Every structure is written in structure tokens, then in C-alpha cells.
Amino acid sequence: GRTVMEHLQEDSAELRHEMEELTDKYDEIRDGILNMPSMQPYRTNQFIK
RNA sequence: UUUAGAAGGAUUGCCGUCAGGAAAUUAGGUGCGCUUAGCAGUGUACCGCCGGAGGCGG
Numbered sequence: 355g356r357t358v359m360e361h362l363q364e365d366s367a368e369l370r371h372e373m374e375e376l377t378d379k380y381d382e383i384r385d386g387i388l389n390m391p392s393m394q395p396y397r398t399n400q401f402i403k
Numbered sequence: 404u405u406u407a408g409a410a411g412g413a414u415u416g417c418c419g420u421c422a423g424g425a426a427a428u429u430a431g432g433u434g435c436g437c438u439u440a441g442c443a444g445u446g447u448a449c450c451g452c453c454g455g456a457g458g459c460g461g
Binding site: 400402403 | 406407408
């Protein structure tokens with residue numbers, strides 16, 4: 355009853371085990387969900403008040 | 404200088420059938436309404452008169 359999110363911050367093998375049988379690249383995926391870029395305000399348009 | 408500036412919600416329709424509210428009753432005792440006044444105000448205006456509309460006599 356926990357979310358992939360909470361397990362990917364601690365890396366409990368509960369996932370460690372389950373992913374590695376179903377894929378070959380859990381290492382690359384976890385680094386891209388744990389260091390995510392932030393949204394930046396860069397421009398405006400006619401649809402923003 | 405406004406969470407700025409813009410907008411067609413539309414068309415159609417069978418709610419129905421039945422029925423026992425019912426029985427009993429104690430509202431009762433008492434009681435100070437009350438001292439003053441002018442229907443007045445003026446109590447209403449009448450006949451005329453020429454004129455033709457407009458103006459004085461009793």
C-alpha cells in the first residue's frame with residue numbers, strides 16, 4: 355500500500371527485485387525520477403492573463 | 404488601463420390501481436373606573452342691473 359514514489363526514495367529492494375526481472379535499465383530510470391528539473395517561467399502569451 | 408479581450412444548449416414525451424382512526428374525561432376561587440367642560444367660528448351670501456361679453460343699485 356505504498357506508492358512507487360516512496361519506494362524510489364529509499365530503494366527498498368521490494369522494488370529493486372521486481373523491476374530487475376522485468377527490465378534491464380532500472381538504474382537509468384531511477385536517476386531520472388529522483389533528480390527532476392524544475393519548471394521555469396520564460397515567456398508569456400495571449401492565453402495567460 | 405479591472406484572472407484583460409470572445410461565446411445560440413437544443414429537439415420528444417400517458418404516473419397509476421386499492422383502502423374503517425378509535426375509545427375516556429370537573430377549569431376553578433377574588434375584586435371601587437373617574438374627577439372637568441359654553442357648537443363655536445360668520446353660518447353663508449338675495450334679487451336685479453345693464454350690457455352682450457364686461458360693470459353699479461337696493
